[PDB]
């Protein structure tokens, strides 16, 4: 006997992508070599984000990029391991160069129209193997419809599952002191 609390405990994070895209398999091979034989911490972070599922790689927008292109960051390279989306509100698009997993049709057109350049994760490794002069970005993880229903309960101000919304669907008892109590 050995009197241990835990035994044969597995890891908690993905160690390989669950997707079977052939091109993505090549991209993992490249960065798996780079991370092993380079001291730059930028390579290790990029490798893990390639494994993540779609809900853990939310899209980023052109507006969110322009937000972080201020206060002395107008000359750096934006790297986004996700999709990049055009924003209809932004009327004037600044000049930037972006390395992203994929672009929408309109986002690619508007970036190069202003005088920018659209890169690729493989071309990024060819130009900046150590990731110098780069900034990483993420999308809003919690900006999803399904997250609003998480942890429903009294005094929590969450969203309920209703087949429709109106005065006939819930409200009533338990939502106003005029009928019993409130939550």
């Amino acid at each position: 006997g050995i009197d241990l609390r835990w035994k044969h405990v597995r890891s908690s994070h993905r160690k390989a992508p669950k997707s079977d895209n052939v091109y993505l398999k090549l991209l993992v091979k490249l960065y798996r070599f780079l991370a092993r034989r380079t001291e730059a911490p930028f390579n290790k972070v990029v490798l893990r984000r390639l494994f993540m599922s779609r809900i853990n790689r939310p899209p980023v927008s052109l507006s969110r990029i322009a937000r972080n292109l201020k206060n002395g960051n107008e000359k750096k390279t934006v790297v986004v391991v996700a999709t990049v989306t055009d924003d209809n509100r932004l009327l004037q698009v600044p000049k930037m160069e972006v390395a992203a997993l994929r672009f929408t049709a309109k986002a690619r057109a508007r970036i190069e129209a202003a005088g920018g350049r659209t890169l690729t994760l493989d071309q990024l490794a060819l130009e900046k193997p150590t990731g110098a002069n780069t900034l990483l970005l993420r999308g809003p993880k919690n900006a999803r419809e399904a997250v609003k229903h998480f942890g429903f309960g009294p005094h929590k101000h969450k969203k309920p599952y209703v087949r429709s919304k109106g005065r006939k669907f819930e409200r009533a008892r338990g939502r106003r002191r005029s009928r019993g109590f409130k939550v």
């Binding site: 309920p160 005065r167 939502r175």
Partner: protein, 148 residues
């Protein structure tokens, strides 16, 4: 595809994953929404607070066409003009001509105002207009006129 499902892995194990003491009988607890006020109250109050009761006055023979007025904010107003003409105005090449936007033809009735507007005069024709939206379009040199 039934070749890969948990019922195939239960072969050879008695009770098929439903337990020995509790034997998966026909309908314990009732059918449907039975027991809403008696024995399923604890579930129906932690979730779904408000199932029971009456609220508000009733409407006989409601016709939803009387209440049709989709709305559009002001920061998306410039997205209505086509892209090729749109870039000319923002670049600043006209300097003497103003566009007239017809909201009804695009399927809108009320013009709300939520974002910002560039300083170019426009003309908006809407059935309804908000108080805040009228001011922003006016300080840019434009005017809004009701059309019915």
């Amino acid at each position: 595809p039934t070749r890969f499902s948990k019922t195939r892995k239960h072969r050879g194990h008695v009770s098929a994953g439903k337990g020995r003491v509790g034997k998966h009988r026909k309908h314990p607890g009732g059918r449907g929404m039975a027991g809403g006020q008696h024995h399923h109250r604890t579930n129906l109050d932690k979730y779904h607070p408000g199932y029971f009761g009456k609220v508000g006055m009733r409407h006989f023979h409601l016709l939803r066409n009387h209440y049709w007025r989709p709305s559009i904010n002001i920061d998306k107003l410039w997205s209505l003009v086509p892209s090729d003409v749109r870039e000319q105005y923002l670049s600043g090449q006209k300097k003497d001509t103003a566009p007239v936007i017809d909201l009804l033809s695009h399927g809108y009735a009320k013009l709300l105002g939520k974002g910002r507007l560039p300083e170019i005069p426009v003309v908006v024709r809407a059935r309804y207009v908000s108080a805040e939206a009228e001011r922003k379009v006016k300080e840019a040199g434009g005017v809004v006129e009701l059309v019915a």
